[PDB]
Each structure stands twice: as C-alpha cells, then as structure tokens.
Ligand binder design. Structure first.
Ligand SMILES: [Zn+2]
Lengths: 241, 234, 219, 329, 280
DNA sequence: AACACCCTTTCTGGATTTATTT
DNA sequence: GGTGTTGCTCCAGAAAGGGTGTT
RNA sequence: GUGAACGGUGGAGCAACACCGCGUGUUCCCCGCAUACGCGGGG
C-alpha cells in the first residue's frame, strides 16, 4: 500500500517469527524497506551473508531489519516472485507475453508492485517502489528500475500496426532486445527508415528504457492479445508455509 | 545430384580391383547385407545388378577410395565407413607393429551445361572392348570412331539418368585419339582379357562439373576421373 | 530573474534513470566549493540548500526550489554500454600460496562471493541539455563555471562538458514546473504530464528514507 | 592536476565486444542467410558526434579502449609494482575482505551497511591509495577520473580539442584476421613410430573410430559433443598509431600524485586489453604532460621532485591496519 | 623475458590467406573489368601505420607470418625434441587425452564451466611446460607471449624503428609464381625479427625456451613442404637486450641451462594426467 | 563452547532476434 | 574451361542444512 | 550532497591440403529387348 513490505501482512497473512528483538530507543529506518522502526517494533539484526551482492542497494546503515523484510528475504519468496504483479486482491503472473500485454496495456486500476527477474534468483521485492498511479508504472527488471507509460506503448504499437498495413509479412520498424543488452538496442532498421516519417522516428528515438524493454516483448511478428495472468496467491502462500 | 568420395589411407597403395576383392573377403563372414550393398549384388543372389553401379571403388595414392552416386550411394557409404575402417585396423593390427588408418570425405555436386564451343577432357584407363563385334569395330578407324562416339555419349546419358538429373540431348562429342592400348584382366591368372584405351581424349561442347564415369567396368575403378580438377587445371 | 540554462557536452553521457533537476547539480557544485573552502570534514547537508534560487511554498509547508529538470535534444542514435566486474584468481592463487593473502577456502565461486563475475549494461546518450529556473544569473554562472562533468559514472570519463550559457527570458517563456512537485502543489502548476508517485522532491534524490507522495513527470 | 599521456602501440590492440557477429570467406559481415558463415569477434567501438566543416555533426564510428579497463590497469600496476613489495617487506598480510576491497573495490567483506563519520571520511580520503580509489563497504568516492584511450583520428576531433592536426591518421584502422585449430591425433602418420601413447597404435584407432561413429550418428539423425577442428576470425586494431590518455586528480596531496607518477614510470611492462597469448597490447610511452609541462624524457620522468619525495616519505608507514579499518570498521 | 630473435630465410615463405583474389597474366591484380581473370593466392598480410609523403601517416601493407603458427611451431619443436624423448625414456607413457591436451590445448571441444582449485593453479603455473602454454578443460592462462614474424622493412619503422635505423630494406618483397595455380611468396634472402616475452618465469621455463630455440633451425615455417618452401637459419639471438648467440649455439645464460637440465631430469607424467583430466 | 567458516543440494517459467568498424 | 573442410565452446544464484574449527 | 557514490570482457586454439603420372593381352559366366537374324550390359 505504501511500502513494498506491506504485502507481507496485507496481501498474504503472515506473522512475526517471535524470535526477534523489540526495538528500544529512538527510531531508525529499515535497511531493506526504508520503513521506520519505532519503539516496541519487532526487528532482527542484519546478518546478510558474504554472498549478498546488493550492498549498493541498501537504503540505510542502521543494520536493522523489520519483521516483514525477514519474510520477504526467504527463499520461497525469492523464487516464487520471479515474475509477478502484486495487488491488494492477490498475486498474478506476468511471465507470458500475453500477460505482459495485459499489464503494460490496460493495467489493473489499483496500487501494485511489479517485479521481474533477470537471472536464476535475485532480491527484487524490497528495493522497488510501489506504484500509486496507473499511468506511471515502476517495474524492476534485475538490476534495473524502469518506468513505463501505457499511453506511449499504445501509441508505438498503433504506429507499428499502421506501417505494417498492406504487407503480407510483418517487418519491425525498430529492434528491441528482450534482455536489453545489445549495442543496437533501440535502433532504426533499414526497413523502418523508409516507412517512418521524421517525427515518428524522433518519437521512437525519445523513449524511456522501460518502454523499450516492454516493446521488446510486445512488438514481434505475432502480436499477443491481452489476457489476465494466472493467480498464484495460494501457491506462494502454501510454499511459504 | 551429388557424389560422395571417401578416402582410406593404410600407409600403402592397393589397386581398386584388388581392394574390392579384399573388402569382399574380409567382410564375407559377417554382415552380408552391407557387403551386398557395397558390391551392388542382387537382393537374393550373389550375381551383381546389371544397372548403373552406384557404389564403385576408385584409386587413391595411399590406399583405395569409395565413390557413392546419388542419395542412396551416399547413404551406403555413410553407413559403411566405420565398419570398413574397423576391419582395416583389425587386419593391419594382427600382423606387424600396426598402422594408423585415416579417412577423408567430400561431397562433390554434379552438373552439366551446354556451351557453343568444344571442350577437352582426357580419360585414363578406360575399357572399350567386351565382345568380338567391338573388336571388329576397333579394326577400322571409321567404324571405330562412331563406336567410341556413341559409347561416350551413352555413358554420359546413363550416369545422368542414374544420378537423377536431366541432361541436354543435343550434345556432340568427338574422339581425338589414345596414347596407348592395353588389356584388362577380370581375375588374376585368367587367360581372358578385355581391350582398353589409355589416356584417351574426348571433346564435348558441354561442360561437366563433377565426377563422371564412362565406358565399361565402372565398379572396378576404370574410366572415371574428376572434371573439376581437369576444368581449369591448376 | 527568469532565465534559461543550456549545456554543451563533447562526450556521450550516461542517460539518467530519473529526472535530473538543476537544483541538485547546483547543490553538488555548492558542496564542492564548501569542501574546497572549509575542508573535507564538513556536513554536506549544511550547505546544499544555500543556492541562488527562489523557493515555491506550497500550503502546509513542503517547499520546493524554482528549478526544473533537464531536457535532452538528442544528436545521436541510442546505444548501450557494457561493463564487467571480475577479480583475478591467478594472482589470488599466487598470493595465497605466498602467505600474503589469508584465505582458507579451497576454490573460487564465480556465481557469488568475493570472486563473483558480473556483467551489466547501461544506455548512453549525446544531447543538448536545457532547463529553466528563477534566480540571479551572476550567482548561477560561477557555480556552473566550476562544473566539468554531468551525469553518472563520472569516474570513467562520461559526460565531459564543452560550454554553457545562461540568458534571461520572459515570464511566460520559462516553464519551471516540469519537476517533482508536492501533492498539495497549486493545480495551476500541475500539468497532464504529472502523475502520482512516491519520489523525492528535494535534497539528495537518491535517499529512499526521504521519499514522499508527489506528482512527477516521466523523463 | 591534469595528466595527459601519449602512447604508441607496437602490437595490435584487441578489446572484445559482446554480440553474435558472423563473417564469410569474403569480407562481407553479417550476410543474409544462405551463405557459408563463420563466427567473428570484433573490437570495441562507440558512436560519437564529429563535427566536420559542413557542420552536419553526423555520427561516426570510433575504436576505443574502455575507461574501466584503463582504470583497472592503473590500479593493478600500482598494487603490484609499489604497494605489494612495500607491504611484503614489513611482513604484512591481508584478510580476504581487505584484499577484495583493495584489489577490486568489493563490499563482500562487510556486506551490511557500514556508517562512517565526517572525520573518518576525511581521514580515509587523505590516504594515498584509499583516497585514489574508493569503494568497499563504505562506498567512498575516490579522487581519480580515468578517461578512455582515444586514437589520434579525424573521427575524434570532438573529444580532442586542438593541437593534434599534425600526425593525424584517417581511414580504417582495423583488420580481420583468421585462426584455426587442428586435431593432433589425426596428424599421426601411418609411419607412426610414436610410443608415448599408452595404447600405441590401438588408442589412436579408437579415437578415430569414435570420431567416425559420432559423425555417422549425426549424419543419420540429420536426415552437443564437439571435436577439435575449428575455423573462426576476430578483428583487431592495426599497430603503429598513437593514442591520447587523460587522467585527472581532484585536489590531490603530493603523495597521491607521486604514486600516480610511480605507476606511470613502472608501466610499459604491462599490456592493454586482451589477447594475452598473442602478445597483443604492447605499447611505448613517447610523452607525458604535467599540467601542460613536458616532464617525460628517454629514461623515466624528470621533474616533480616534491611529488616523488612526498611519495617516498609516504611509502614508509604503509601498514595493513589501515586496509583492515577501511575494509571492516 | 623479452627475448628478441633475428632470422633469415633461404627459400620462399608462403602463408596462404583465406579469401578470393584474381590476377591477369601477372599484369594486374583484381582489375575492374572481368577480362582475362585468373585465380591467385596471396601470402598473409598486415596493415601498419607508416610515414609516407614526409609528414603524413598512412596504412601500408606488410607481409608477415602469423604469430599463431609460430607459437604452434615452438610448441611442437619443444615437445618433440626435448619433452618427448625424456618422457618416453624410463617409461612414463601418456594417455591419449593427455597427448591431445599437450599438442592442441584442450582435449575436447566443450569446456566445463566449473572453476579450478587454487592449489591446482599454483602447481600448474609452476610446471616447466604446462605453465608456459596454458589451456586445459578449465582454460588456464599461460605465461608465454608469442608475436608474429616481421621483416625488417622501412614500412615497419613505427614498430621497430629505434632498434634498426640502418640495415632496413625497401621495395617489394613478393614474387608471383605460376606453379596454373598461381600464388605469391616472399623472396628468399631476407631478414626477419621475432619477439617473444614471458611474465614472471622460473629459470627452468627460460632454459626450456632456449633449448627449443637451439633445435628449431631444422624445422620449417609455414609454406608448402612439397615445394620445399620455408627453410630458415637462426642468428643474432638477444636475451633481455644482451647478445647470447654464437655460431655454435647460445653459449650464454648458464643458470637457465642448469635449471632446465634439473627440471627435465625429474619430469613425470602425473602432472599431464592431472591437467588433462576434466572434472565435468 | 558458541559462533565463524567451508561444502553440497535445490528451486523457480517463456520463447524472438538488426546490422554506419579494411 | 575448379572445388571441398571448418561454419565455437563456457558464464556472470543466493538460501539452507550439516560438518568442522579457533578460542 | 549530478537516483549519485563502488565494478577488467576475459582466458585456450598451425589455412594448406586433398582430388592428376604409375600392373594386366582374348572368348568365359550371367540380365533384358526380342523372340533368336541379333542388339544392347553386369562381372
Ligand atoms: Zn523493511
């Protein structure tokens, strides 16, 4: 709702481990979530481990963890939330291309959290902000924090469909990488240099990296149709417990 | 289509006809079907097929070579290469210190195109005489020119049909001459012999881009040479 | 007192992930000057707000500088830059054998730990940068003349500046409200580009403990 | 404290780039499908906006060596030719956390947050090596700005201000070279007479038989395991041209400038980028300018006596305790 | 460490370069018109920045022999003339995988992605041969760097100008031969320079390099062995800038020779088996 | 005598691709 | 009035449990 | 206090061969078209 760790008690029903200490003295921020740890709040001292490679993403140096990030840091939560969108109603998947088309075009109208993994297993839940608005979406993709506007995605898709009219085959005006790693990620192709006007080329040139990453999934030969993702609330809940 | 050429090196040179008998002997006891496929035998009997031989032994400096025409001919060689290599290694390992047997393979595509000018092709060790009538035709140059003439043209037609490609039916070939004349024996120490031509030169308006075989006794490695090495010889 | 700022760079620079506000760069330059004056053992939060800019006071506090975020006029196609982090194991082996390094582990692990190998990619851009603000030009020009790089990854040579220019414009000419604004900001300043989010409206914009509800536009 | 170094590579420079590119036997790169295609690894290259007399300021390709590579090279030569012997002579040792922080800037020594006071931050930024390069669990900021290597080329008119019009090169400065790998077992002749192999002439025949069997199985399947034969190509930068390297120091002490000059003096026994087995990356220094003043001669650097004396004084007292305190706290 | 070798060829040197090039009855190379075209084979080539026009820098061709072939030649002559007789003596057979690993680096086409222990790296980098040429399943880094063979030519002044101000030739050094397969070769009687470097080597490794350099003269450089191309002689070997070559051999740097004698006295095949073994 | 350090399993879902570097 | 062969291989994850030591 | 500050694209590999010049000396077996007057060809 406000912090990424609110999902621990709001979306799913979880409680403190009861083996944690109770905070005494003036308050400090949680090292992972940026949530204040006031007087009487359960918390755990920070022992992340030598395999923790996210020191540059820590929010503070208080070396304290609230009882919700303790749940967020478990392995079932690490591999169960590899690609999902979190809303008050429940947890849904965005793994498939059609699910991404549903999310980045006509999103669900609520506060929600979007995370996507870029490797085998990663820490992503506690270092991504929640999105309070529908037309400005914060999405975390591995070590990248992106911003996606559905209007820009819709306009680009409409442009791509317009230029492809009257052709028996599909040709992409621009190249986008699903991994967002190629040197020519976002370039104008030779075919797109002849069927695109100057203002359209300038529009494609000036686009945020997150929109390029989304258009990588949404703009190919077979155009996916939006449909809702599979609900994985009970699967995650029973894996955690 | 294409013809596959496989080279076996035993560290010594053995003749193609002798290599055929050696391969027949070594694999006689086991895997008779593979030997029949190599030797183009009839499915039920030992007598060989009358049609154009797909698998024919050839000449190599360090051993013998195998040629396979068409998809079937290439497939037979593909399934036969490891067995033949193992048999060679076992044979040469029993006697002496032992040799290392190396192989090599190529896929040469076949082609032919018609051009309005004569082209020069030489043939080495080609057999032309099989019956008394052929011997009589060889007596007089006028009646023998046409005989060699049609023999060359019909050998080209037969190989083209067997490999599965169409050849232009307006080719005109001619025969310039031969360096030498010698006989070919089917089996060693047999009085019967077959007349042959050595280093014969033939002339066709068309151009040929692969391995092509002419004359009689093709499967014994007689009268076949690569046109590609001869075409723009380096 | 209304003026515009334009910056020329002779080198591709790292493309900013979020808005790069003019007041943040001015605060960095002012803190650098304070470090050169008083020494390295100073509190940067004492001097980072001592800027020659006016402040917009929203109802119920929540003030914000009268400075906008930089806009890019692209001159190159968008390209992507790759960098790698790795720790050598041959020299590590020699040092461990010689006793200079005190390690008791058997073998390195490239998946994680001290000897992890990592690859990461970031986009780069070359553009004209422009921004609008309200303040005194004489005060702004010196600080900007002290600046020689813009953007992130400044330690590997990204974003060398070639020149700058400050000029006055009309009151309607300069939009300074294209910036992260407070939630209670007067609806006149808020445009359709501004959307609700959780972001920083002041100070060091990377400090997550200071993020608040805000209306901000997408870069 | 601006330092500008001019170099000249004697061997090709090869800085590999990510990506899947292909070449033919001819020079055409990334051909349409239907032609024989071989893998190719190119150098590193970036697009820059070069203004020509036309003023079109179009985009042109420039071949460079990344600044991260040069920064790491400077760090490694400092650590190997200066810090390592001085620390070893005193009989000092480094823990894994201190070693990782000093040699790479890693934070895995104390992966949690490590706070530091303003006096503490100043006392580390005064240290020569710790002040030159930051990092560690503190994530401190260093005082070094290391730019990338730029060839003296007409495509680099924008980056290099002026004064390089002479001895400037134009045109291509890269070439594609081919490499091969051969199977040594197949090279064994029938004359053999090799008995180092355990099986003699029987093991080699087994190796050949496995090759033949694998080929037969693959051919049957067509109508994974990989052998030793290979044929591929890569792209290098031609030798003999000269480059420009710029390093900037932010309000440095004399000891830090002395350490930088010591590293520059002890250079030229190192290599740039990769291609280790082929002796790629060799170079010679032909000029060093110290704030516009030429201080490089045939034998080392002549000048900067205060810097050298300060660094000589600062080398003594170099103990592992400062490294341990910066690493862990 | 920074050994420089000067060599002379007595027969033409040929190093075919992949590609397609054409000649017309020796008159011209790659004419714009497709008239009297014939196939031609070129020797390996290297562009170098040079001073032409007295003030401007341009790229000019230079005929070289690639450093990969020289490194392989060094490996093979050292493995045949030195390591092989010492190994085969007193027993000590090698396995087939170890043989392939010693001759061509890896023994298979696929390397395992696992790392190797610190002790294995430390012991392998100290071996007289394995430490020189790296490789193996885990891709160990060797400490030998082999450059290419450059002729001492006025085009390579920006590469080797300081050392040889004089004794530099000029003009074409290539001749086209018809035998109708036409190829171009480097003319005999030419002086080349070869640079080899080692980083932090033991005395045994330097001794092994010198031993290999002693027996190298009977080998051949690139070329077509049927046409007896590629013969050469060795002179003017300089070690770390000091001349250590005589008409009868090296005759210098005795510590390296003693160290290599001791090292090859106690070589065993256990290290080869341990290095070649793949822990997949 | 308990925390520091090392080794060794294990767990998670989808699907396309361009080309300004002798 | 030449053509076949080779036509790439590895990887960039942290949690969790159990077995060992310094002291 | 420039959503900043910290980060090595690396390690191993022969373009030069392969396909060309080199032994047999006279009526024996099989396969088709015919339908034997003979043509074609397999070994
Ligand atoms: Zn938290």
């Amino acid at each position: 709702m406000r912090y990424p760790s609110d999902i621990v008690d709001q979306v799913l029903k979880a409680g403190p481990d009861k083996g944690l200490l109770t905070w005494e003295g003036v308050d400090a921020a949680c090292s992972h979530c940026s949530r204040p740890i006031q007087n009487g709040d359960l918390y755990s001292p920070s022992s992340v481990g030598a395999f923790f490679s996210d020191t540059r993403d820590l929010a503070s140096t208080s070396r304290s963890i609230c009882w919700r990030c303790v749940v967020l840091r478990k392995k079932p939560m690490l591999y169960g939330l590899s690609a999902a969108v979190v809303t008050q109603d429940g947890i849904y998947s965005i793994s498939k291309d059609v699910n991404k088309a549903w999310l980045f075009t006509t999103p669900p109208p609520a506060p929600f959290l979007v995370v996507h993994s870029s490797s085998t297993m990663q820490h992503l839940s506690w270092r991504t902000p929640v999105t309070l608005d529908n037309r400005r979406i914060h999405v975390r993709y591995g070590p990248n924090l992106f911003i996606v506007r559905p209007e820009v995605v819709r306009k680009a898709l409409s442009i791509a469909d317009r230029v492809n009219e009257g052709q028996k085959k599909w040709v992409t005006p621009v190249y986008f990488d699903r991994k967002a790693a190629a040197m020519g990620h976002g370039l104008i192709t030779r075919a797109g240099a002849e069927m695109l006007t100057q203002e359209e080329q300038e529009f494609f040139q000036s686009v945020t990296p997150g929109e390029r990453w989304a258009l990588s999934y949404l703009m190919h030969s077979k155009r996916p149709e939006p449909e809702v993702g599979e609900c994985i609330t009970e699967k995650v809940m029973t894996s955690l417990n | 289509m294409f013809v596959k050429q496989v080279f076996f090196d035993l560290g010594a040179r053995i003749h193609a006809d002798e290599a055929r008998a050696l391969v027949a002997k070594l694999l006689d006891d086991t895997q008779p079907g593979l030997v029949s496929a190599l030797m183009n035998y009839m499915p039920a009997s030992k007598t060989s097929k009358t049609e154009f031989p797909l698998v024919q032994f050839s000449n190599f400096n360090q051993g013998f070579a195998l040629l396979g025409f068409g998809e079937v001919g290439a497939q037979i060689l593909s399934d036969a290469t490891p067995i033949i290599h193992d048999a060679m290694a076992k044979l040469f390992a029993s006697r002496g210190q032992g040799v290392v047997v190396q192989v090599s393979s190529r896929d040469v595509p076949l082609s032919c195109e018609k051009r309005p000018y004569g082209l020069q092709y030489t043939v080495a060790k080609m057999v032309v005489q099989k019956k008394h009538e052929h011997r009589e035709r060889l007596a007089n140059p006028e009646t023998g020119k046409v005989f060699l003439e049609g023999l060359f043209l019909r050998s080209l037609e037969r190989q083209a049909a067997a490999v599965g490609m169409v050849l232009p039916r307006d080719l005109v070939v001619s025969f310039k001459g031969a360096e030498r004349v010698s006989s070919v024996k089917l089996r060693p120490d047999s009085t019967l012999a077959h007349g042959s031509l050595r280093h014969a030169v033939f002339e066709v308006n068309a151009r040929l881009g692969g391995l092509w075989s002419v004359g009689f006794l093709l499967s014994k490695g007689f009268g076949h040479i690569n046109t590609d090495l001869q075409l723009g010889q380096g | 007192v209304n003026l515009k700022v334009t910056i020329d760079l002779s080198n591709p620079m790292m493309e900013p992930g979020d808005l790069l506000h003019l007041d943040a760069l001015l605060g960095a330059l002012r803190v650098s000057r304070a470090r050169a004056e008083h020494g390295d053992a100073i509190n940067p939060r004492d001097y980072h707000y001592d800027l020659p800019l006016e402040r917009y006071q929203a109802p119920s506090g929540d003030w914000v500088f009268k400075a906008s975020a930089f806009k890019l006029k692209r001159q190159l196609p968008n390209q992507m830059w790759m960098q790698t982090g790795r720790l050598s194991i041959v020299e590590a082996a020699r040092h461990r054998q010689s006793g200079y390094l005190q390690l008791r582990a058997g073998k390195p692990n490239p998946a994680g730990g001290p000897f992890k190998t990592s690859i990461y990619h970031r986009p780069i851009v070359q553009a004209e940068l422009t921004a609008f603000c309200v303040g005194d030009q004489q005060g702004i020009e010196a600080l900007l003349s002290e600046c020689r790089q813009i953007g992130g990854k400044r330690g590997v040579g990204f974003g060398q500046v070639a020149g700058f220019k400050v000029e006055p414009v009309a009151e309607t000419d300069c939009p300074w409200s294209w910036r992260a604004l407070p939630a209670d900001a007067d609806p006149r300043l808020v445009t359709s580009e501004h959307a609700r989010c959780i972001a920083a409206i002041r100070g060091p914009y990377w400090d997550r403990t200071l993020h608040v509800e805000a209306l901000a536009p997408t870069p | 404290m601006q330092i500008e170094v001019t170099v000249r590579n004697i061997t090709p420079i090869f800085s590999a780039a990510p990506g899947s590119n292909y070449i033919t036997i001819d020079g055409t790169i990334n051909p349409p499908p239907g032609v024989s295609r071989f893998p190719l690894v190119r150098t590193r290259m970036m697009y820059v906006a070069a203004d020509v007399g036309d003023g079109v300021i179009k985009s042109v390709p420039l071949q460079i060596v990344p600044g991260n590579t040069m920064r790491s090279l400077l760090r490694r030569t400092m650590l190997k030719h200066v810090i390592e012997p001085a620390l070893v002579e005193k009989g000092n040792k480094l823990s894994i956390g201190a070693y990782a922080t000093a040699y790479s800037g890693n934070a895995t020594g104390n992966p949690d947050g490590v706070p530091s006071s303003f006096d503490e931050i100043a006392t580390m930024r005064a240290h020569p090596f710790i002040g030159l390069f930051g990092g560690g669990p503190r994530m401190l900021e260093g005082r070094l700005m290391v730019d990338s290597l730029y060839p003296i080329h007409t495509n680099a008119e924008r980056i290099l201000g002026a004064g390089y019009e002479n001895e400037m090169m134009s045109g291509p400065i890269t070439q594609v070279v081919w490499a091969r790998r051969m199977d040594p077992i197949l090279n064994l002749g029938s004359s053999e007479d090799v008995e180092v192999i355990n099986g003699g002439a029987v093991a080699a025949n087994g190796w050949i038989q496995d090759l033949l069997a694998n080929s037969k199985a693959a051919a049957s399947k067509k109508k994974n395991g990989r052998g030793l034969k290979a044929f591929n190509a890569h792209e290098v930068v031609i030798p003999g041209l000269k480059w420009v390297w710029r390093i900037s120091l932010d309000r440095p002490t004399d000891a830090q400038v002395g350490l930088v000059l010591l590293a520059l003096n002890k250079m030229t026994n190192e290599r740039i980028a990769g291609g280790h087995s082929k002796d790629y990356g060799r170079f010679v220094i032909d000029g060093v300018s110290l704030n516009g003043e030429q201080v490089w001669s045939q034998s080392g650097i002549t000048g900067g006596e205060q810097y050298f004396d300060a660094v000589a004084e600062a080398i003594d007292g170099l103990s592992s305790k400062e490294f341990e305190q910066f690493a862990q706290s």
